[PDB]
Design a protein around this ligand. Sequence first.
Ligand SMILES: [Zn+2]
Ligand SMILES: [Zn+2]
Length: 322
Amino acid sequence: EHQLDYPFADTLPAAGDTFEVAPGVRWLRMPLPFSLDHINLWLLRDEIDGQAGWTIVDCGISSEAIRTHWEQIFDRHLDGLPVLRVLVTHCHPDHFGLANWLCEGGDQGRWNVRLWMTLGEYMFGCLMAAGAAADHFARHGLYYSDLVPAVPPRYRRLREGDAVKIGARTWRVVTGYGHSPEHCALHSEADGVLISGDMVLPRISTNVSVFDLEPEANPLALYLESLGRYETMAPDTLVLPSHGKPFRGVRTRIAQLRAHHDARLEEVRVACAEKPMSAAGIVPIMFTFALGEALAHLNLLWLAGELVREHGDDGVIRYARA
Ligand SMILES: [Zn+2]
Ligand SMILES: [Zn+2]
């Protein structure tokens, strides 16, 4: 991380509190009970139809800790203004879980506002909250509703290239692929601010996986292509990532992510040059989730013509050179 610039140094907002990272832009940090221990949420000062308030970006999972901290932020750090709408970058549970609860005003029903989301994320989120994977993981070498217990039944659709006026800014929708169906990052070009969601994280790489639902997918190529959207943005762009700290150096970080994935891909090349490898066989070299990440690297090489697949007489799919 030492090649990155953290403009606020050791600053981390306390739970239940905000930190102003830019005029009208407040940073909240919520605890998560996983190895990924936090998510950053954004409170944006706003005014819609003459009414001043806040646009929320991302929600937290549905947990007692996060809910309690939202109630504290409602009580102490909204200047007595309402939330005007809830905007969600993508459907992963730490971003989307509390969307319905937020939309409907939290524990005390303080407002009733609309969810803003991309169609792919909202639809996929709906599909997943309505809840096989054994015949899929076996052929490669081997609950969402707890975190998202309700979903808003309506939404206002965000699309690539939309201009979303929030307070004094025009945030441009920048869609990203490979991590999730249709990931919404928000770009404010005039002043140089980027709400990056999970597409550009300063300290950790972005999850990229192949699942049973789309088993020939190429998420890593999609992701590596999506990264070009931030590479061309201003060098001094303030990045607001959902995990880690606000930072400058987006081009430097992306250079690191591209190098990292290149090293990962090369290890997979090396392994399949020795003998045909299954996704399960790639895991110990590369590092249930991990199989999906191994499948993403194998599928990229496969779809690029660098590997061929074969269904073995034991029903395992293996990847080797042509
Ligand atoms: Zn995510
Ligand atoms: Zn995330």
